[PDB]
Design an enzyme around this catalytic site. Structure first.
Site, PDB file in Angstrom:
ATOM      1  N   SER A  33       9.654  37.490 -47.103  1.00  0.00           N
ATOM      2  CA  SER A  33      10.433  37.981 -48.234  1.00  0.00           C
ATOM      3  C   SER A  33      11.874  38.298 -47.868  1.00  0.00           C
ATOM      4  O   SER A  33      12.707  38.444 -48.769  1.00  0.00           O
ATOM      5  CB  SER A  33       9.768  39.217 -48.836  1.00  0.00           C
ATOM      6  OG  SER A  33       8.684  38.853 -49.675  1.00  0.00           O
TER       7      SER A  33
HETATM    8  C1  LIG Z   1       7.657  38.571 -49.375  1.00  0.00           C
HETATM    9  O1  LIG Z   1       7.428  38.727 -48.219  1.00  0.00           O
HETATM   10  C2  LIG Z   1       6.517  38.788 -50.330  1.00  0.00           C
HETATM   11  N1  LIG Z   1       5.375  38.367 -49.584  1.00  0.00           N
HETATM   12  C3  LIG Z   1       4.259  37.644 -50.160  1.00  0.00           C
HETATM   13  O2  LIG Z   1       4.233  37.371 -51.313  1.00  0.00           O
HETATM   14  C4  LIG Z   1       3.144  37.214 -49.215  1.00  0.00           C
HETATM   15  N2  LIG Z   1       2.157  37.928 -48.932  1.00  0.00           N
HETATM   16  O3  LIG Z   1       1.967  39.196 -49.499  1.00  0.00           O
HETATM   17  C5  LIG Z   1       1.228  39.992 -48.613  1.00  0.00           C
HETATM   18  C6  LIG Z   1       0.489  41.076 -49.393  1.00  0.00           C
HETATM   19  C7  LIG Z   1       3.321  35.849 -48.563  1.00  0.00           C
HETATM   20  N3  LIG Z   1       2.360  34.835 -48.423  1.00  0.00           N
HETATM   21  S1  LIG Z   1       3.016  33.689 -47.712  1.00  0.00           S
HETATM   22  C8  LIG Z   1       4.468  34.081 -47.435  1.00  0.00           C
HETATM   23  N4  LIG Z   1       5.385  33.185 -46.757  1.00  0.00           N
HETATM   24  N5  LIG Z   1       4.661  35.359 -47.934  1.00  0.00           N
HETATM   25  C9  LIG Z   1       6.523  40.323 -50.693  1.00  0.00           C
HETATM   26  N6  LIG Z   1       7.133  41.100 -49.383  1.00  0.00           N
HETATM   27  C10 LIG Z   1       6.383  42.402 -49.058  1.00  0.00           C
HETATM   28  C11 LIG Z   1       7.095  43.439 -48.192  1.00  0.00           C
HETATM   29  O4  LIG Z   1       6.988  43.389 -46.938  1.00  0.00           O
HETATM   30  O5  LIG Z   1       7.799  44.333 -48.728  1.00  0.00           O
HETATM   31  C12 LIG Z   1       4.648  42.297 -49.063  1.00  0.00           C
HETATM   32  S2  LIG Z   1       3.703  43.655 -48.322  1.00  0.00           S
HETATM   33  C13 LIG Z   1       4.172  45.136 -49.256  1.00  0.00           C
HETATM   34  N7  LIG Z   1       3.322  46.246 -49.019  1.00  0.00           N
HETATM   35  C14 LIG Z   1       3.838  47.444 -49.882  1.00  0.00           C
HETATM   36  C15 LIG Z   1       3.224  48.840 -49.939  1.00  0.00           C
HETATM   37  C16 LIG Z   1       2.133  49.050 -50.712  1.00  0.00           C
HETATM   38  C17 LIG Z   1       1.566  50.314 -50.775  1.00  0.00           C
HETATM   39  N8  LIG Z   1       2.103  51.332 -50.066  1.00  0.00           N
HETATM   40  C18 LIG Z   1       1.574  52.685 -50.074  1.00  0.00           C
HETATM   41  C19 LIG Z   1       3.195  51.123 -49.293  1.00  0.00           C
HETATM   42  C20 LIG Z   1       3.764  49.860 -49.228  1.00  0.00           C
HETATM   43  C21 LIG Z   1       4.995  47.010 -50.621  1.00  0.00           C
HETATM   44  S3  LIG Z   1       5.253  45.561 -50.268  1.00  0.00           S
HETATM   45  C22 LIG Z   1       4.060  41.647 -50.143  1.00  0.00           C
HETATM   46  S4  LIG Z   1       5.115  40.749 -51.207  1.00  0.00           S
END
Ligand SMILES: *C(=O)[C@@H](NC(=O)/C(=N\OCC)c1nsc(N)n1)[C@@H]1NC(C(=O)O)=C(Sc2nc(-c3cc[n+](C)cc3)cs2)CS1
Length: 419
Positions: free
Chosen positions: A171
């Site tokens: 991301s």
């Molecule tokens: C960009 O990295 C986005 N990533 C995705 O859509 C992907 N996977 O999601 C994993 C759950 C993916 N598949 S393939 C590829 N090349 N990327 C968004 N970036 C973020 C981020 O790091 O901010 C993620 S994880 C996230 N976890 C939270 C969170 C939730 C709950 N709590 C209490 C705290 C933090 C926010 S974001 C997913 S999407």
């Protein structure tokens, strides 16, 4: 018997030097005893993949180009300058800062991952770290078949230089997607887009695919989407941009371009073909998915545009090398708008990098998790003086934790030293 040339950091501290030992009759360090000069690496595992190790000239070595020879790393790539003749080898001074190199390696603690720290305005690689690592002093001055096989049987592969390996950027690539949308005119930073739910698709043609997000926001603008890690916003902005406006912006970067670094590295790619040939892949590439493969060194190079008013600087590893740039990769207003909004990742208490918040320092950041198991990424930008840039990743973040969870000692160290 001429002495091999030395590799030193930016401050003259030794990275690959010569040191005499009392060995336990031909050569462990104390048969017989004699003072023999040995190739020594003060930073040990912290810079093993970058520096490499030496070895004896084998039969197939002299069988190509006619006592020690560089087998891997910069010890191999710089052999002609360090070997000399029988004239002592010359000393090659790098851009590495030993203090920053040992900080970036310490935060991993056997976790698979990489970290690169640059000078975003000069291109100086302050640190290139790959974890796990190996002992370069043992590999160069006689390692047993018990420790060698221990390194080969390691499923995390400590010999590979992860800073030169291509991965999906995650991301953190939204920073480029958002900046391209700003210069294209399709992405207005202050317009409020209505996004409802945790899943979204263009129409029925996408079928069982949806752009998913985490935090539910009500109207999402540019600043909110970067802090909330909203895939749907950048997906909709990518589909609004079109394949041509998106590729027109991406092609200004260093995709498919070979760099003059003395590190072997596959050029970054956008996709397998010249066209996306789909629309779910166009949205995926919008938020860092798709078929993007960028290495940590190439990622730090692309993201340097935000700290140079849109100008890309190339990475340099030798100190005396002239600074090379690629002018106007993105606008100055686009670079500043994205870099300013990324301050919320650290400064907003709901931000995902709020653990590193420092009231006396401006630090723009952007998180990212990619599914390949999942890897974690963390890009930080010195917005106080534009004197450092970090690109940290942790492989298998579901078991080893995120890059943000371990990078606080590193970021705190840079803000006090590099400032
Ligand atoms: C960009 O990295 C986005 N990533 C995705 O859509 C992907 N996977 O999601 C994993 C759950 C993916 N598949 S393939 C590829 N090349 N990327 C968004 N970036 C973020 C981020 O790091 O901010 C993620 S994880 C996230 N976890 C939270 C969170 C939730 C709950 N709590 C209490 C705290 C933090 C926010 S974001 C997913 S999407």
């Amino acid at each position: 018997n001429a002495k091999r040339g030395e590799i030193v950091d930016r401050n003259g501290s030794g990275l690959a030097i010569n040191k005499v030992f009392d060995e336990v009759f031909v050569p462990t360090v104390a048969a017989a005893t004699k003072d023999t000069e040995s190739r020594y690496y003060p930073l040990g595992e912290a810079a093993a993949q970058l520096i490499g190790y030496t070895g004896t000239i084998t039969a197939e070595d002299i069988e190509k180009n006619p006592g020690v020879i560089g087998k891997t790393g910069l010890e191999r790539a710089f052999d002609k300058e360090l070997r000399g003749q029988d004239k002592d080898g010359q000393t090659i001074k790098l851009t590495i800062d030993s203090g920053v190199q040992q900080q970036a390696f310490a935060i991993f603690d056997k976790r698979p991952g990489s970290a690169v720290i640059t000078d975003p305005q000069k291109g100086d690689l302050l640190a290139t770290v790959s974890s796990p690592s190996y002992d370069p002093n043992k590999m160069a001055n006689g390692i047993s078949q018990k420790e060698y096989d221990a390194y080969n049987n390691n499923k995390d592969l400590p010999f590979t230089a992860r800073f030169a390996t291509g991965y999906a950027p995650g991301s953190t690539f939204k920073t480029i997607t958002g900046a391209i949308g700003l210069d294209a005119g399709t992405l207005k930073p202050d317009e409020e887009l209505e996004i409802n739910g945790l899943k979204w698709q263009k129409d029925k043609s996408w079928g069982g695919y949806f752009a998913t997000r985490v935090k539910e926001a009500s109207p999402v603008n540019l600043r909110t989407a970067l802090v909330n890690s909203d895939n749907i916003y950048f997906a909709q902005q990518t589909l609004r941009m079109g394949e041509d406006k998106f590729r027109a912006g991406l092609n200004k970067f260093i995709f498919g371009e070979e760099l003059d670094l003395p590190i072997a590295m596959t050029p970054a790619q956008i996709s397998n073909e010249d066209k996306f040939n789909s629309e779910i892949l166009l949205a995926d590439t919008g938020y860092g998915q798709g078929q993007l493969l960028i290495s940590p060194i190439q990622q730090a190079t692309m993201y340097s545009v935000f700290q140079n008013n849109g100008t890309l600087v190339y990475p340099k590893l030798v100190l005396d090398k002239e600074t090379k740039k690629k002018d106007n990769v993105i606008s100055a207003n686009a670079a500043n708008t994205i870099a300013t909004d990324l301050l919320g990742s650290v400064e907003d208490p709901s931000g995902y990098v709020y653990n590193m918040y420092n009231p006396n320092f401006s630090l723009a950041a952007k998180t990212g998790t990619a599914e390949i198991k999942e890897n974690s990424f963390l890009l930080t930008l010195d917005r106080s003086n534009n004197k450092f840039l970090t690109m940290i990743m942790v492989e298998n973040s579901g078991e080893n934790g995120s890059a943000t969870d371990i990078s606080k000692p590193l970021i705190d160290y840079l803000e006090a030293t590099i400032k």
